[PDB]
Structure 1
Amino acid sequence: EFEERIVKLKRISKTTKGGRNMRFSVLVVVGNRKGKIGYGIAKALEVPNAIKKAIKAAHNSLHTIEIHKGSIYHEVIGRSGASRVLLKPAPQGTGIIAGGAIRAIIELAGYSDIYTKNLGRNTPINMIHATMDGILKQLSPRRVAILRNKNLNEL
Structure 2
Amino acid sequence: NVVQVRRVTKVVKGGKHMRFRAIVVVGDKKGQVGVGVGKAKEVVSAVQKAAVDARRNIITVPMTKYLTFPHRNEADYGAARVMLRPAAPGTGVIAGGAVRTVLEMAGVENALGKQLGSNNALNNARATIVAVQTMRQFSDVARDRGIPMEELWK
Superposition TM-score tier, normalisation by shorter sequence: over 0.9
Which of 44, 50, 54 is the aligned partner of 2:46? 50
Q: Structure 1 counterpart of 2:3, which letter? A: V
1:28 aligns with 2:31: no
Task: Look up the match of 1:133.
Answer: 130
Structure 1: stretches of 5+ with no match in the other structure: none
Question: Which deviations, in whole Å up to 9, do the C-alpha atoms of 1:5-56 show, x marking residues without a partner?
Answer: 1111010001112211110010011000111111110000111111111111
Q: Is the 8 A contact 1:141 1:153 kept in 2?
A: no
Pair 1:153–1:104, CA change in 2 (3 A):
farther
| Root-mean-square deviation (Å) | 1.0
TM-score, normalising length: structure 1: 0.94
CA–CA separation in structure 1 for the residues paired with 2:150 and 2:135 = 15
Secondary structure of the 1:119 match is strand
SS at match of 1:116: strand
**Structure 2 segments unaligned to the other structure (5+ residues):** none
Which stretches of structure 1, 4 residues or longer, exceed 4 Å deviation after superposition? none
Find the aligned partners of 1:102 and 1:47 in 2 and give their Cα distance.
23
Deviations 1:123-143 (A, max 9, x none): 001100111111001011111
Q: Is 2:6 aligned against 1:13? A: no
2:82, 2:120 → 1: CA distance? 12
Which one of 36, 41, 56 corresponds to residue 40 of structure 1?
36
Deviation at 1:153, TM superposition (A): 4.7
The SS at the match of 1:122 is coil
Please say if residues 37 and 108 of structure 1, whose CA atoms lie closer than 8 Å, have aligned partners that are also in contact. yes
State the partner residue of 1:86: 83
Decide which moves more: 51-60 or 24-33.
51-60
Give the CA deviation at 1:80. Answer: 0.4
2-structure distance, mates of 1:95, 1:18: 51
